């Protein structure tokens, strides 16, 4: 069970302020003034059935990053040492009520008064705020989204997910609950699980937490390619009809053909994508969100200091001196690893592999071009306006477009079983 | 489509299905399109029958 | 009967009738001793108390402890028998030797 | 998940109840009756009856 | 009846088998060994001719 | 053999009140654990024990008993409302996080108190009722404040009489308030008593002498002194998170215990 | 006691779960509707009785 | 509920639906932009006393069986499931209006 | 027939029509949609006793 509640805010991507402005804030708060916008994000991505887009929100990762930036820029008001909640403004916005329920336009006096200058990469403790300390349920409800934001902001790459394999997790209630999702997709399962977690925080070793861990393990094993129709984990797997597509859909399935042999014990590790094209992959973001929702009362293992930048080191609840390593991968190379593993297993042919490779190459080309164009547009806007600089997507560099530790990550995930 | 009439719907729904005999504007537009994006292309068959 | 959950149903029908006189522990908070015996139709519904007799106190539930002992010790055991002429007529067995 | 009650709640432990006087309402009734007895037995009131 | 249950859905098939599953997760798969078919061989023979 | 204190107390009470006590006899001798044995019974008298899952609820018995000649005199000893039928209620468990999770769906407006030092029978929380203390005029004091005041005075006496080589039952005798600050005002007796509890725990000493046997007049004088005008001129302020110990305080309770107490280096 | 099936299924759609904020807002609206008027609340108590 | 603690007796319950001149934060205008609610309902003391003095159980009552029989018909309704959807639509309408 | 070995009780029976070298749609057979291993059948306890 978690004992320390700490979180990290976003850092400036070369600018001198939090990369968000009034236009983006209004577009985010267009339909609701609550800064906690997990449900709104779920509605916006529309089950990941297609490529969502907009003028100010080109991708789903764009909206995720903007939510993180808004929370980082806004939460610094009640976390000042004086702990006052409604005397200063941030971008023509003020908190309503000490319980942090919504953001409203500033009164005329506060509008005349100067705004707050936010800082970068701040680390805060939830128990410092008196109201959060007083109310446990409120703190537990907020800490899910705070943990998701922290998992996104911890490094400069994409979000982080947690994979765990343990045979003792399975039980009668877990089997009964899992059997009900026979034909649903990963997005729908994530939607229902997230809504349930929002309604009630889970306990340390509850049925919902165990089933969430099992679902994450199944999804990642299927994604790598260790588990398939002819090699199932207790007759469960994930099927994807069009691998390498722009919007992949994964469906839970059962098969009685064969069940793999699982060594006894408890194993786990931490996965993340490095290539920028994660902005258009709903499944990865949803997996990270599920891990964040889990982090409310589970106290996951520590992350090794050497895998994170200097500013993220020695966080009381997240990083440590000796911890697990972060494994990063590239989607395009992982597709090839998937195809090769299936072919060695003997359930795929060369022509099918070639077709999958061609489709993946086309998708990668398209995504790369779109991302570069959007980055250039953002740069031009920042050059034009020097007082309202912003970013619409998390900044990336040219080096991140090459394969990294994909082979090692695939080997580790395979050895997990 | 479920309804009294279907001949009109079968021609409205799929522009690419029409043949292109002459050099009219409609025929040029149809001939300038791909041939392998029409009808169903993905299904979720979870049970038999 | 051929129902594989029959031994559990024999145990829980007495436990239902003993509510208010004897108590036994249960695994989760949702299910109680008053759950109807006819609902235990799948293997995932078997309680921990029935599987491990040591969790039934001989002081709190004296009679229910004995009832569990009778089921675990004197329930009939399955057996086998041979039939047919597999050398000439063959066999149609699938999951058993022919 | 919580309901409040203006009286004390003590869960029953048997399914075959019998008469019982260990209740706050029964104590209330007994105290009222004994108070009225004291009023009647008061020496500034009894001589008039 | 003769092959009627095979026409319920997706007649495209290769081989028949049957399985059952335990509670822990293990499964047993029985795949009968096809000896042959005189009719199928004769049909393919006429294809040569 | 080792006997169960809960069962012993319940047995004596039931026998003195002429209730069914023959069922408590087979539980007199501990089998594995006191709390486990009481949790596993399920069906008992239920005016002594109620099981809420893995938390056991126990009614708190009287600590004092009045005779016929108690007359609320100035020189009568104060009883701190612990002579009434029910002043508080105890919840026993094995872990403080389990107790905290239990209090998510339970009323706590009255106030929750805790001993982080060696508890009487293990980890337990204490919840007060709506009774009152009226033996110290002109003040009316509720049960939670009464127990806070009693514990604070005991700790102050222990601090005065402490010796380097004389053992004591508990290093810290003060009650700490864990839940229920929402209903406590900033200028209230409960808040000021919390401040005094912190001072006593950290080791301050009263200037006025404390009589070996307390009296209602002395208690009323002390409460009037507390409620008089002024400010808090010490750097110690109460928080519900933990009990904070100054860097240069003589207390050693943080080394003795494993949870509840935190020493502050910057607080001098 | 109630029972549920244990087998593969056909993807039912039963939308019934909402948030505590929505519940609280609806409760506040109902309380606003019923204000200072006994005749609006008395039949509810009659039904409960 | 407070027993005899006069300081904690509730004296006002109010709801708000508007805002004052330039006040934007509800925590600053709830105190002075609210309307009190509440109503007293009268009862007869004689009926309550008679009910308290004259009460009896059936001759042979087993609580678990009685309640299992009585509660079963009541738990076949779906009006609560309907009310959930009604509440969702209400909140949607409010946000759309603003 | 297992006696009280919970880990070895059969729960599901299914039929497949695809070879074990391919990946296809999970078209489960109709026999797998039973809560029990087979079609339920009720009996009268009084008659047997």
Curated annotation (Swiss-Prot), chain A:
<dbReference type="GO" id="GO:0039625">
    <property type="term" value="C:viral inner capsid"/>
</dbReference>
<comment type="similarity">
    <text>Belongs to the orthoreovirus sigma-1 protein family.</text>
</comment>
<protein>
    <recommendedName>
        <fullName>Inner capsid protein sigma-2</fullName>
    </recommendedName>
</protein>
<keyword id="KW-0946">Virion</keyword>
<keyword id="KW-1153">Inner capsid protein</keyword>
<dbReference type="InterPro" id="IPR004317">
    <property type="entry name" value="Sigma_1_2_reovir"/>
</dbReference>
<keyword id="KW-0167">Capsid protein</keyword>
<comment type="subunit">
    <text>Interacts with protein mu-NS; in viral inclusions.</text>
</comment>
<comment type="function">
    <text>Inner capsid (core) component.</text>
</comment>
<dbReference type="Pfam" id="PF03084">
    <property type="entry name" value="Sigma_1_2"/>
</dbReference>
UniProtKB/Swiss-Prot annotation, chain F:
<feature type="site" description="Involved in formation of the phosphoamide bond">
    <location>
        <position position="82"/>
    </location>
</feature>
<protein>
    <recommendedName>
        <fullName>Outer capsid protein lambda-2</fullName>
    </recommendedName>
</protein>
<comment type="subunit">
    <text>Interacts with protein mu-NS; in viral inclusions.</text>
</comment>
<comment type="function">
    <text>Outer capsid protein involved in mRNA capping. Catalyzes the last 3 enzymatic activities for formation of the 5' cap structure on the viral plus-strand transcripts, namely the RNA guanylyltransferase, RNA-7N- and RNA-2'O-methyltransferase activities.</text>
</comment>
<comment type="similarity">
    <text>Belongs to the orthoreovirus lambda-2 protein family.</text>
</comment>
């Amino acid at each position: 069970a978690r004992a320390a509640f700490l979180f990290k805010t976003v850092g400036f991507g070369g600018l001198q302020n939090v990369p968000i402005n009034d236009e983006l804030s209004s577009h985010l708060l267009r339909a609701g003034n609550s800064p906690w916008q997990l449900t709104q994000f779920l509605d916006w991505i529309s089950l990941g059935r297609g490529l969502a887009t907009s003028a100010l929100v080109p991708t789903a990762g764009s909206r995720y990053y903007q939510m993180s930036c808004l929370l980082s820029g806004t939460l610094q008001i009640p976390f000042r040492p004086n702990h006052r909640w409604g005397d200063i403004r941030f971008l023509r916005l003020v908190w309503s009520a000490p319980t942090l329920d919504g953001l409203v336009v500033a009164p005329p006096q506060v509008l005349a008064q100067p705004a707050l200058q936010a800082q970068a990469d701040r680390v805060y403790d939830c128990d410092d705020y008196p109201f959060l300390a007083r109310d446990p349920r409120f703190k537990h409800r907020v800490y899910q989204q705070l943990s998701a934001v922290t998992l996104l902001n911890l490094t400069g790459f994409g979000p982080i997910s947690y994979v765990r394999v343990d045979e003792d997790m399975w039980s009668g209630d877990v089997n009964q609950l899992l059997m009900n999702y026979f034909g649903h997709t990963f997005a729908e399962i994530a939607y229902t699980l997230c809504q349930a977690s929002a309604n009630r925080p889970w306990e340390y070793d509850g049925t919902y937490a165990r089933m969430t861990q099992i679902v994450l393990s199944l999804f990642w094993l299927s994604y790598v390619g260790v588990i398939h129709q002819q090699n199932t984990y207790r007759t469960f797997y994930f099927q994807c009809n069009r691998r390498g597509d722009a919007a992949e859909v994964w469906i839970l399935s059962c098969s009685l053909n064969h069940s793999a042999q699982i060594r006894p014990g408890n194993r786990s590790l931490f996965v993340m994508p490095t290539s920028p094209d994660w902005n258009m992959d709903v499944n990865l973001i949803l997996s990270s969100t599920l891990t964040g929702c889990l982090c409310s009362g589970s106290q996951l293992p520590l992350i090794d200091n050497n895998s994170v930048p200097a500013v993220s080191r020695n966080i009381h609840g997240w990083t440590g001196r000796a911890g697990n390593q972060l494994h990063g991968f590239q989607v395009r190379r992982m597709v090839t690893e998937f195809c090769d593993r299936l072919r060695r297993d003997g359930v795929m042919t060369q022509a099918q592999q070639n077709q999958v490779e061609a489709l993946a190459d086309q998708t990668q080309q398209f995504k790369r071009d779109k991302l570069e164009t959007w980055a250039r547009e953002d740069d031009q806007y920042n050059q034009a306006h020097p007082n309202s600089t912003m970013f619409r997507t998390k900044p990336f560099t040219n080096a991140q477009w090459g394969r990294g530790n994909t082979g090692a990550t695939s080997a580790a995930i395979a050895a997990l079983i | 489509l479920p309804g009294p009439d279907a001949e009109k719907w079968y021609s409205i729904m799929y522009p690419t299905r029409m043949g292109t005999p002459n050099v009219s504007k409609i025929c040029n537009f149809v001939a300038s399109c791909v041939r392998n994006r029409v009808g169903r292309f993905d299904r979720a068959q979870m049970m038999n029958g | 009967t051929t129902d594989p959950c029959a031994p559990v149903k024999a145990f829980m029908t007495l436990a239902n009738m003993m509510v208010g006189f004897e108590t036994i522990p249960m695994d989760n908070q949702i299910y109680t001793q008053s759950r109807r015996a006819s609902a235990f139709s799948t293997p995932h519904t078997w309680p921990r108390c029935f599987m491990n007799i040591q969790l039934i106190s001989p002081i709190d539930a004296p009679i229910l402890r004995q009832w569990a002992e009778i089921i675990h010790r004197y329930w009939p055991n399955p057996s086998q028998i041979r039939y047919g002429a597999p050398n000439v007529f063959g066999s149609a067995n699938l999951f058993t030797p022919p | 998940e919580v309901l409040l009650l203006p009286i004390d709640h003590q869960p029953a432990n048997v399914t075959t109840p019998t008469l019982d006087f260990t209740n706050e309402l029964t104590n209330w009734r007994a105290r009222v009756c004994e108070l009225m007895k004291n009023l009647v037995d008061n020496q500034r009131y009894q001589p008039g009856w | 009846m003769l092959l009627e249950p095979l026409l319920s859905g997706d007649p495209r098939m290769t081989q028949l088998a049957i399985q059952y599953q335990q509670y822990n997760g293990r499964t047993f798969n029985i795949i009968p060994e096809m000896p042959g078919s005189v009719i199928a061989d004769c049909v393919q023979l006429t294809a040569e001719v | 053999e080792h006997v169960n204190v809960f069962v012993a107390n319940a047995l004596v009470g039931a026998f003195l009140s002429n209730q069914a006590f023959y069922d408590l006899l087979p539980l007199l001798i501990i089998n594995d654990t006191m709390i486990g044995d009481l949790l596993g019974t399920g069906a008992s008298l239920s005016q002594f024990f109620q099981s809420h899952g893995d938390v056991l609820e126990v009614a708190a018995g009287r600590k004092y008993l009045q005779m016929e000649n108690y007359s609320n005199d100035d020189d009568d000893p104060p009883l701190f409302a612990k002579d009434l039928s029910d002043y508080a209620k105890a919840f026993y468990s094995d872990t403080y996080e389990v107790l905290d999770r239990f209090f998510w769906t339970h009323d706590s407006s009255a106030g929750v108190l805790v001993h982080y030092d060696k508890p009487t029978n293990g980890h337990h929380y204490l919840l007060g009722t709506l009774t009152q203390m009226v033996s110290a005029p002109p003040y009316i004091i509720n049960a939670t404040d009464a127990m806070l005041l009693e514990s604070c005075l005991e700790q102050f006496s222990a601090n005065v009489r402490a010796r380097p080589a004389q053992p004591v039952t508990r290093l810290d005798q003060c009650y700490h308030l864990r839940w229920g600050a929402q209903y406590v005002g900033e200028d209230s007796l409960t808040y000021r008593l919390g401040v005094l509890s912190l001072l006593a725990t950290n080791g301050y000493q009263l200037a006025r002498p404390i009589p070996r046997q307390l009296t209602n007049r002395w208690l009323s004088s002390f409460v009037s002194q507390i409620m008089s005008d002024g400010v808090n001129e010490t750097p110690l302020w109460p928080q519900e998170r933990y009990v904070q110990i100054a860097y240069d305080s003589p207390s050693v309770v943080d080394g003795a215990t494993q949870y509840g107490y935190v020493r502050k280096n910057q607080l001098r | 006691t109630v029972t549920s099936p244990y087998a593969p299924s056909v993807n039912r759609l039963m939308p019934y779960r909402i948030s505590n904020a929505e519940r609280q807002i609806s409760q506040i609206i109902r309380i606003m509707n019923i204000g200072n008027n006994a005749t609006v609340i008395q039949p509810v108590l009659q039904d409960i009785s | 509920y407070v027993r005899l603690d006069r300081d904690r007796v509730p004296t006002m319950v109010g709801v708000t639906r508007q805002s004052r001149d330039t006040i934007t934060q509800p925590a600053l205008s709830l105190s002075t932009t609210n309307t009190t609610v509440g109503v007293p309902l009268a009862l007869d003391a004689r009926a309550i006393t008679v009910a308290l003095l004259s009460g009896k159980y059936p001759p042979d009552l087993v609580t678990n069986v009685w309640y299992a029989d009585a509660i079963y018909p009541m738990y076949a309704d779906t009006e609560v499931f309907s009310n959930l959807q009604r509440d969702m639509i209400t909140c949607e309408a409010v946000q759309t209006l603003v």
